[PDB]
From a paper:
The HIV-1 Env is a trimer of gp120-gp41 heterodimers that are heavily shielded from the host immune systems by N-linked glycosylation and further protected from neutralization by conformational masking and considerable sequence variability. A glycosylated region near the base of the third variable loop (V3) of HIV-1 Env forms a supersite of vulnerability that is targeted by antibodies originating from diverse germline genes in multiple HIV-1 infected individuals. Here, we determine structures of antibodies in complex with HIV-1 Envelope for all observed members and ancestral states of the broadly neutralizing HIV-1 V3-glycan targeting DH270 antibody clonal B cell lineage. Here we used cryo-EM to visualize the interactions of a complete inferred DH270 clonal tree with the co-evolving virus Env.
The DH270 lineage is derived from the VH1-2*02 and Vλ2-23 heavy and light chain genes, respectively, with a heavy chain complementary determining region length of twenty amino acid residues, DH270.6, the lineage member with the greatest breadth and potency, neutralizes fifty-one percent of a multiclade pseudovirus panel with a geometric mean potency of ~0.21 µg/ml. From the I2 intermediate the clone splits into two paths, both culminating in similar neutralization breadth, albeit with DH270.6 having the greatest potency. The I2 intermediate acquired additional mutations at clusters 3, 4, and 7, with mature DH270.6, the most broad and potent antibody of the clone, further modifying interactions at cluster 7. The DH270.5 and DH270.6 antibodies acquired several mutations near the LCDR1/VL N-terminus where interactions with the N301-glycan D arms may occur. The cryo-EM reconstructions in this region were poorly resolved, precluding a precise definition of these interactions. Although the N301-glycan D arm was not well-defined in density, the VH and VL of both DH270.5 and DH270.6 acquired several mutations in proximity to the N301-glycan D arm. Densities consistent with both the V3 GDIK coupled and uncoupled V1 loop states were apparent in the DH270.6 bound trimer. Additional mutations in DH270.6 occurred near the N442-glycan and the V1 loop configuration that was displaced from the V3 GDIK motif. Examination of these structures indicates mutations after I2 occurred primarily at regions more distal to the epitope, consistent with the ability of I2 to neutralize most of the viruses neutralized by DH270.6. Additionally, structures of DH270.6 bound to d526 Env containing G300 and d949 Env containing N300 show few changes in the overall epitope conformation.
Numbering used by the authors:
A (entry chain K): 32 to 139, 150 to 185, 185a, 185b, 186 to 309, 312 to 321, 321c, 322 to 354, ...
B (entry chain L), C (entry chain B), D (entry chain G): 520 to 547, 569 to 664
E (entry chain F): 194 to 244
F (entry chain A): 134 to 139, 150 to 185, 185a, 185b, 186 to 193
The structure:
C-alpha cells in the first residue's frame, strides 16, 4: 500500500518571532498601596505553580546581541517611567534669577553647595516673597559671561522645563519577571559555558523569567545574578575595539557607601496647592561623599579578569586606565543610592596591572585596606534623552547609607597600536541596554506552531 | 508533560502527549492596551487553527487521516526513518516548504467527500 | 473565487465554493481602540454563527440537512424554480422574513433526535 | 425558559432546557476599556469551555456519556435520590470537590479510544 | 478659600447635574439576582427571587 | 513697513516684549506679520497699538 496524509494537533514545533511580553511582580509587593510603585500599578501578581520544565534531546541556538527582549524592555521602562511623572509638580516659577553668596554654612566654605536666594511667586501670586535654598554646583550655571558673578540660574529652563519626582513613589529596584502570553513559551539555556552565541544543550522551558532588577548603572553592574562557574567574557566581536565587552563575575564584590553629611529638608510653596523640596541648613561638620571597595578583593577580581582575558589573548599582559576624560554621566560610576544620585571617579579602581602570571591574592598585608572613590552628587538629573528629559530629585534627610554587590563590569578596549603587549582597557558606559543584556542573556521566546503533517497508513472510511 | 515537554521525544512518543500542550493556548492579563492586543491575537490564532481543522472534517484532537496519497517528493522517506527515529522539529524542517500544497490538498479531500454523501443522504 | 466571487452565480454553481468565502472572516489591526472593538465584534459574530451551527448538530461547513418538512408558505416555488435559475441574494430577498421561525424549527429538530439517541445509547 | 429560569427544577425537568440558557454567553458594549477586558474574558471563558468539551469527544450540547464507571465516593447516592428529587445546585454543592479528578478522567478515557480507532482505520 | 490647598476648576455650564436614572447590566457569563421579598432585613435567606 | 525703504503693503513690522526663558529678564523682540493676523487693539484712539 501507499501512505496517506494525516494532520496532528498539539505538535511541539517552534518558530522565532517578535512578540509582546507582559510583566509580573513578586506577590509581597502587592501588599503596597495603589499608585505607589510599578508592581501594584501596572503588572500582574505572580504564582510559581508552573515551575521550570527541563527538556530532553532538544538543541537550540541562542544569540545574545540579537535578542529582542531587551529592546522591548527598554521601551517598556521608558513608557512606564514617563507615565510615573505626570501627577507631580512641573516646576516652572523656579527658573528665576538666583543670587548666590559665599557658602558660609557654619563659617568656612562648603565647596560643593552654594547658598542661593530667589523670589518666589507665592500661591496668592501678588504677595511674592524671598526664599533661600542650598544647591549643588552641577545644578547652578552663571547667568552671563560678564563680571556680575553673584547672579546665577538653574541648569534647566534653557533646554526644558524640568520636573520634580513625587516623594511618595520609590526608586527601589523591584524584581520584575517577564512572562510568555497565550500560545508562547520561554526557552532558557542552562549551560553556564555559554559564550554569547551558539548552541545550548541543557535547555528548559519556563512560564516566567528570573526576576530582573532594572538598576541603571555605568562602569559597574549592581545587584544582579551571579555567574555559575567562573568569570565570563561576552562580546559580539571580541576583536572589535568599538564593541562593549561585558564581564560577568562569579565571586561577588561587596561595596558599601554613604553620604556622611547630615542634610535637612526644606519645604517651599511654589504656586497654588503644590510644594517643592530643597536643601536647607546642614547640621554638623562637612564631610566628603565617597565609596569604598576592599583592596585585596578588587586586585583578586582584576587578576582573575586578566586570567580570563588571557583565554583569548595569547601572551600579552592586561593593563587598565581611566575613562577618556568625558562628561559627568559618561566618565563616572553613576548609580542610585536611596533616591540620591552618585557620580564616583573610577580612576583609583583601575590604576593597576596584571602581568600574565597571577600572584597569590591573600599575601596578607592588611585585610582592612580599602580603595576609596571620591563622589559628587547632582540633583537636576538629565536622565535619558527622550523621556521627559529632565527630573529633579528631592533631597532626603539624614545621612543615607547603601550597600550592594558588584557582579559585572563594562569595558572598552583602547585601540590596539604598535603591536603593544598589553592592549589596555578602559571602563565604558552609555546605552543602558547592555546592563539588561547582562541579565536577559539566557532567554528566548518561541512562537508555538501546533499543527503538523505526517504520512500515516491511516485512511478515512466512508 | 506540560506545555513543551514533548520536544525531543520521537514520533511514537509524541503521537500521545497532545492535549497537555494544546490546552494552554488561552490566557491574558493587564499591563496596557498592547497586552489586550496580543491576547486578542492569540485568541484569533487559536480560532483560525480550529477553523482550518474545521474545513477538513477533523474537528478534534484525534489522529485525523484523510484519503489523499502521499507523494514521494514531500519526504522521500521510509517508514522506519520517520517513526522510529525522527522528532517533530527536524521533521518540520523538511516538510514545511509544502504548505500551499498540503493545506489545499486537504480542502480537496473535503471536496471529494461531500456531494457524494449529500446524494447518498437524499437519493437513497 | 475568493471572498465574494460567487455572487451572481446560480444555486447549483454556489452549492460549492463556500469555504474560500467563509475562510476570510477573521483579522484585525491598529488605528485605535475602535478597530480593536470592531475586531472583537467580528470574532464575536463568527463565534455566534458557529454556535448556532453547533446547536442543530451541523458543526461543519457541510450541507447539513435536518428532517423537518418544508412548508409551502416559505417559498411557493418549484424545485426547478429554485435550483437552476435563482441566485442566493434574491432567494434571501424572499426567505428572510421567516428567520424567527426557521432558526427555532431547527432547534426543534434537535429536540426530536437527542433523548431518543440517549435511550438507544443507554437502554439498549 | 430564558437565561436562568430553569433553576429550581429537578434533574428530569432540567435534562432539557439547556440551549436557551447556554446561547446567551456572548455580548459586550462600551463604557471604557474595562468593558473590553470583561468582554474578551467572557469570550475566553466560553471558548475554554468549548475546548474542554472538545478534548473529550463530546463537541456539542448533547448528553455526552463516556465509559468510566461511577465511583461511589463521589455521590453515595441511589438513582431515585438523584433523578427523582434533586436539582443541580445542591447537586453541585456535593460533587464540586472532585472536579479536578473528573475532568482528568474524561481525558483518560479519551486516552483509551482513538488510537484503537486509528488502528481500526489503518491496520484493517 | 482655595489656592493654599488646591487650584481648582469651574464646572462647565452646559453639562447639567440632573440625576439621570442609570441601570446596571451584567455582561456575558454573569447574571443579576433580585430578591422580591419586602421583609428582607439586610442579611440572610430570600425565596421570592427573580433574575 | 520700511523693509528696504518704501512700504510692503502686506507685511507689518511689529515689536513686542517677550517674557524670556528666565522669566525675570524679559526683552524686546521684533517680527513681521501679515495684516490678516493683526487687529487694532482698541476702538479708543491709539493707532500704533496692535494685537494678534
Ligand atoms: C544662607 O543664606 C541665608 C540668607 O538668605 C542665611 O540666613 C540668614 O543668616 C544670617 C546670618 O546668621 C542671619 O542674620 C539671618 O537672620 C538669616 N536669615 C534667615 C531668613 O534665616 C542662612 O543662614 C544661610 N545658610 C547657610 C547654610 O549658609
Ligand atoms: C549615620 O551615621 C551614623 C554614624 O556614622 C551611623 O551609625 C552607625 O552605623 C554603623 C554601620 O556600620 C554601625 O556599625 C554603628 O553601630 C552605628 N552607630 C554609631 C554610634 O556609630 C548611621 O547608621 C548612619 N545613618 C544611617 C541611616 O545609616
Ligand atoms: C523692523 O523694525 C526693526 C526695529 O525694531 C528694525 O531694526 C532696526 O532698524 C534700524 C534701521 O536700520 C537700525 O538702526 C537698527 O539697528 C535695527 N535694530 C535691530 C535690532 O536690528 C528692522 O530693520 C525692521 N525690519 C524691517 C524688515 O522692516
Amino acid at each position: 500500500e501507499n501512505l496517506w496524509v494525516t494532520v496532528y494537533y498539539g505538535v511541539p514545533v517552534w518558530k522565532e518571532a517578535k512578540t509582546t511580553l507582559f510583566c509580573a511582580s513578586d506577590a509581597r509587593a502587592y501588599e503596597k498601596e495603589v499608585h505607589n510603585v510599578w508592581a501594584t500599578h501596572a503588572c500582574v501578581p505572580t504564582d510559581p505553580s508552573p515551575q521550570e520544565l527541563v527538556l530532553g534531546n532538544v538543541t537550540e541556538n541562542f544569540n545574545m546581541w540579537k535578542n529582542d527582549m531587551v529592546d522591548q524592555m527598554h521601551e517598556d521602562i521608558i513608557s512606564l517611567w514617563d507615565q510615573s511623572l505626570k501627577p507631580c509638580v512641573k516646576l516652572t516659577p523656579l527658573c528665576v534669577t538666583l543670587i548666590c553668596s559665599n557658602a558660609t554654612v557654619k563659617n568656612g566654605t562648603v565647596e560643593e553647595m552654594k547658598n542661593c536666594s530667589f523670589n518666589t511667586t507665592t500661591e496668592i501670586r501678588d504677595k511674592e516673597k524671598k526664599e533661600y535654598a542650598l544647591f549643588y554646583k552641577p545644578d547652578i550655571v552663571p547667568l552671563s559671561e560678564t563680571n556680575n558673578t553673584s547672579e546665577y540660574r538653574l541648569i534647566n529652563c534653557n533646554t526644558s522645563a524640568c520636573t520634580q519626582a513625587c516623594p511618595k513613589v520609590t526608586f527601589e529596584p523591584i524584581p520584575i519577571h517577564y512572562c510568555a502570553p497565550a500560545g508562547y513559551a520561554i526557552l532558557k539555556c542552562n549551560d553556564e559555558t555559554f559564550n554569547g552565541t551558539g548552541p545550548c544543550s541543557n535547555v528548559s522551558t519556563v512560564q516566567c523569567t528570573h526576576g530582573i532588577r532594572p538598576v541603571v548603572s555605568t562602569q559597574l553592574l549592581l545587584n544582579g545574578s551571579l555567574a555559575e562557574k567562573e568569570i565570563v567574557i561576552r562580546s559580539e566581536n571580541l576583536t572589535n575595539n568599538a564593541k562593549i565587552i561585558i564581564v560577568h563575575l562569579h565571586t561577588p564584590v561587596e561595596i558599601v557607601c554613604t553620604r556622611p553629611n547630615n542634610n535637612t529638608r526644606k519645604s517651599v510653596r511654589i504656586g497654588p496647592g503644590q510644594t517643592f523640596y530643597a536643601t536647607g541648613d546642614i547640621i554638623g561638620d562637612i564631610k566628603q561623599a565617597h565609596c569604598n571597595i576592599s583592596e585585596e578583593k578588587w586586585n583578586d577580581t582584576l587578576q582573575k579578569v586578566g586570567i580570563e582575558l588571557q583565554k583569548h589573548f595569547p601572551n600579552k599582559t592586561i593593563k587598565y586606565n581611566q575613562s577618556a576624560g568625558g562628561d559627568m554621566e559618561i566618565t563616572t560610576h553613576s548609580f542610585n543610592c536611596g533616591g540620591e544620585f552618585f557620580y564616583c571617579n573610577t580612576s583609583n579602581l583601575f590604576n593597576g596591572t596584571y602581568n600574565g602570571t597571577y600572584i597569590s591574592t591573600n599575601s596578607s598585608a592588611n585585610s582592612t585596606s580599602t580603595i576609596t572613590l571620591q563622589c559628587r552628587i547632582k540633583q537636576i538629573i538629565n536622565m535619558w534623552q527622550g523621556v521627559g528629559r529632565c527630573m529633579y530629585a528631592p533631597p532626603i534627610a539624614g545621612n543615607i547609607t547603601c550597600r550592594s554587590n558588584i557582579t559585572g563590569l563594562l569595558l572598552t578596549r583602547d585601540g590596539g597600536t604598535n603591536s603593544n603587549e598589553t592592549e589596555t582597557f578602559r571602563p565604558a558606559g552609555g546605552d543602558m541596554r547592555d546592563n539588561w543584556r547582562s541579565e536577559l542573556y539566557k532567554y528566548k521566546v518561541v512562537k508555538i506552531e501546533p499543527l503538523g503533517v505526517a504520512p500515516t497508513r491511516c485512511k478515512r472510511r466512508v | 508533560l506540560g506545555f513543551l515537554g514533548a520536544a525531543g521525544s520521537t514520533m511514537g512518543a509524541a503521537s500521545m502527549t497532545l492535549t497537555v500542550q494544546a490546552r494552554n493556548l488561552l490566557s491574558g492579563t493587564v499591563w496596557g492596551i498592547k497586552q489586550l492586543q496580543a491576547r486578542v491575537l492569540a485568541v484569533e490564532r487559536y480560532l483560525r487553527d480550529q477553523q482550518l481543522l474545521g474545513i477538513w472534517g477533523c474537528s478534534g484532537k484525534l489522529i485525523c487521516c484523510t484519503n489523499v496519497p502521499w507523494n514521494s517528493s514531500w519526504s522521500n522517506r521510509n517508514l522506519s526513518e520517520i517513526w522510529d527515529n525522527m522528532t517533530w522539529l527536524q521533521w518540520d524542517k523538511e516538510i514545511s516548504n509544502y504548505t500551499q500544497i498540503i493545506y489545499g490538498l486537504l480542502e480537496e479531500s473535503q471536496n471529494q467527500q461531500e456531494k457524494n454523501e449529500q446524494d447518498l443522504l437524499a437519493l437513497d
